[PDB]
Amino acid sequence: TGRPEWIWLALGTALMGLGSLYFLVKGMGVSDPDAKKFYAITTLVPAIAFTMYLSMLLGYGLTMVPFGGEQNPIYWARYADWLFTTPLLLLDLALLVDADQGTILALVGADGIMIGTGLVGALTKVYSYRFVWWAISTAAMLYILYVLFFGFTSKAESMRPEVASTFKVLRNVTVVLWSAYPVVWLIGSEGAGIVPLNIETLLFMVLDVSAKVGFGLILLRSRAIFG
Ligand SMILES: *C/C=C(C)/C=C/C=C(C)/C=C/C1=C(C)CCCC1(C)C
């Protein structure tokens, strides 16, 4: 098939795989129960991403959606990855600041809406309606980020500075990275079709790897994970 974006797909597979392994290797040596909690969640995240980059590298997770007078190439495997990796990353942040169950439930629930409406949008055939779903998915994301910035940060204040300072770094990387996804979608293949798929795949790989392995490295090399 030889598509232009495959090299970016091979590179995402490689980074996710390696990252996952190292997390698994480091996770199975630790004995602290709480540290175990965090290690298992954080290793699972790039492990799911790896299997999906792999499938996409191999020709799966792609569909031609008609709109704008074109047969548009939409990588839906992406949302199958994010459906489970985005709430797991949220879970990691919540366990860190001892968020309440209702908060977690409501954050995981807003995240299901975001990915769900996002995919519906990336699958929608009436061009302008693609942006209506996109708009709702983004409002869901702004809800989640509001909660991470205003709620959590506040709770990380009952924690010790080492823990509060690790959370603020992960919160910052998360707000910066997640903010970028909706803009990539908008000017890329699912949206305006301004940025081509190969470049678009590159941006998504950089955001995904940063948000999973980048995030994981920061979290797991910290002392805040300990019970
Ligand atoms: C490992 C993956 C991460 C941290 C993915 C984050 C993905 C997002 C924040 C995605 C957001 C989207 C929107 C706000 C609207 C349009 C569609 C999405 C799903 C790309």
Curated annotation (Swiss-Prot):
Keywords: Cell membrane, Chromophore, Hydrogen ion transport, Ion transport, Membrane, Photoreceptor protein, Pyrrolidone carboxylic acid, Receptor, Retinal protein, Sensory transduction, Transmembrane, Transmembrane helix, Transport
Membrane topology category: Multi-pass membrane protein
Biological process, per Gene Ontology: phototransduction; proton transmembrane transport
Family the UniProt entry places it in: Belongs to the archaeal/bacterial/fungal opsin family.
Site (Primary proton acceptor): D81
Gene Ontology, cellular component aspect: plasma membrane
Pfam annotation, one family: Bac_rhodopsin
Cytoplasmic side: 26-39, 93-103, 151-168
Subunit architecture: Homotrimer.
PANTHER family from the UniProt entry: BACTERIORHODOPSIN _OPSIN, NOPA (EUROFUNG), PTHR28286
Protein name: Bacteriorhodopsin
Entry GO MF terms: light-driven active monoatomic ion transmembrane transporter activity; monoatomic ion channel activity; photoreceptor activity
Cellular compartments annotated: Cell membrane
Modified residues (N6-(retinylidene)lysine): K212
Summary of the function given for this chain in its UniProt record: Light-driven proton pump.
Membrane-crossing residue ranges in chain numbering: 6-25, 40-58, 76-92, 104-123, 131-150, 169-187, 200-219
Modified how: The covalent binding of retinal to the apoprotein, bacterioopsin, generates bacteriorhodopsin.
Extracellular side: 59-75, 124-130, 188-199
Species annotation: Halobacterium salinarum (strain ATCC 700922 / JCM 11081 / NRC-1) (Halobacterium halobium)
